[PDB]
């Protein structure tokens, strides 16, 4: 029931984790991504995160397993807690706005190179008051 747009988005996201393109996400790959976002997960945290998404016990995530995880996340309502934590991932300087520079930084660090025009468009998907940045209320509205 996923559309070609959605599948394309999920494949692009998968590619940011599966840097070697071997078709699976490993604990090492997940660790690299999370450290690029400014987190410092422990080895146990990474193992649990991979293993809770894995469906067949081989200790890695393939694209069908990732799709199952994403399709569920998209249907689900998001918690206040997880939205607040995610906002801080982008709002590096803690000023209560996600700027175009901060969003581009996060995308670059994940391995997705965007043009300024592409970053600005992603910001437009959330900005409401027209200042070209995303405050917390705008971020919450986007996620709800």
């Amino acid at each position: 029931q996923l559309t070609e747009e959605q599948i394309a988005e999920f494949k692009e996201a998968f590619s940011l984790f599966d840097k070697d393109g071997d078709g699976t996400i490993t604990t090492k790959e997940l660790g690299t991504v999370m450290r690029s976002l400014g987190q410092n997960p422990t080895e146990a945290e990474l193992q649990d995160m991979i293993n809770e998404v894995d469906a067949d016990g081989n200790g890695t995530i393939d694209f069908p397993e990732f799709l199952t995880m994403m399709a569920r996340k998209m249907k689900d309502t998001d918690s206040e807690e997880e939205i607040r934590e995610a906002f801080r991932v982008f709002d590096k300087d803690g000023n209560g706005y996600i700027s175009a520079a901060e969003l581009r930084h996060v995308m670059t660090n994940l391995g997705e190179k965007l043009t300024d025009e592409e970053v600005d468009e992603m910001i437009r998907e959330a900005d409401i008051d027209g200042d070209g940045q995303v405050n917390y209320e705008e971020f919450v509205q986007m996620m709800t």
Binding site: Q6, A8, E9, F10, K11, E12, A13, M34, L37, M49, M70, K73, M74, D78, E82, I83, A86, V89, L103, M107, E112, E118, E121, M122, I123, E125, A126, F139, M142, M143
Partner: peptide, 16 residues
Amino acid sequence: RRREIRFRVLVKVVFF
């Protein structure tokens, strides 16, 4: 081709 990830989808990824 360049595949855009919409901002909302990206955030969902960052939830883990």
